Design a protein around this ligand. Structure first.
Ligand SMILES: *[C@@H]1O[C@H](CO)[C@@H](O)[C@H](O)[C@H]1NC(C)=O
Lengths: 48, 48
């Protein structure tokens, strides 16, 4: 159970590295390098 | 307050209790299931 909880936390924080189809996993760079009406679409895709 | 009913005989009954102990061990592979024999859907999946 201790390992299962640890693995669940590890996968959850590894899912932040996932892009989910967005141009990049990092939120700050895509927010900085994209204009509002397409950055919001990418941010929404990452949020979903 | 002074009367008791006592059985002068007995019946040996048999009762059937059915309990499920297991289910079919079904395995589904994601890469084959959602992305059929195509690489590009697998590349899109890797973003997830
Ligand atoms: C008890 O019941 C059984 C049937 O279940 C019967 O054959 C038997 O004769 C009975 N015995 C008495 C003492 O009534």
């Amino acid at each position: 159970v201790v390992n299962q909880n640890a693995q669940a936390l590890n996968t959850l924080v590894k899912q932040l590295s996932s892009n989910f189809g967005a141009i990049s996993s990092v939120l700050n760079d895509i927010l900085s390098r994209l204009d509002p009406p397409e950055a919001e679409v990418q941010i929404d895709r990452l949020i979903t | 307050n002074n009367s008791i009913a006592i059985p002068t005989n007995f019946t040996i009954s048999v009762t059937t209790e059915i309990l499920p102990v297991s289910m079919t061990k079904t395995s589904v592979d994601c890469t084959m299931y959602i992305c059929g024999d195509s690489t590009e859907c697998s590349n899109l999946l890797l973003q997830y």
